[PDB]
Amino acid sequence: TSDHMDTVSQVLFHPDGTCLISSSFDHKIKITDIRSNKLIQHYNAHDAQVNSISIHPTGYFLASAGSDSKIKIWDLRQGRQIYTLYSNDKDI
């Protein structure tokens, strides 16, 4: 609580299995490392009933999904949200 509110969603990893990624019902992704359980940024997520995620294989993109039907993609090499996607009815 690394701050999450409820039932945590998918936990993802840096390509090397480090810097794990998590969010839950709370609208934020935390990217935190292993043992050295330190945060690099708050990857604010969707205001979803619940969120969801996968990260592009290169570890560059956080695909922020969730129970609501807005979808957005993050660029981890920048730390910006790239943008909120058109989405067009997708509670991914």
């Binding site: 330190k38 945060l39 708050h42």
Partner: peptide, 24 residues
């Protein structure tokens, strides 16, 4: 950068909590 906001921030809340609690 926003991680530095977390740095107390939230760091002392958990201990700011604690005293008083058992006394009650």
């Amino acid at each position: 950068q926003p991680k530095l906001v977390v740095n107390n921030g939230t760091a002392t809340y958990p201990s700011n909590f604690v005293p008083k609690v058992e006394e009650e």
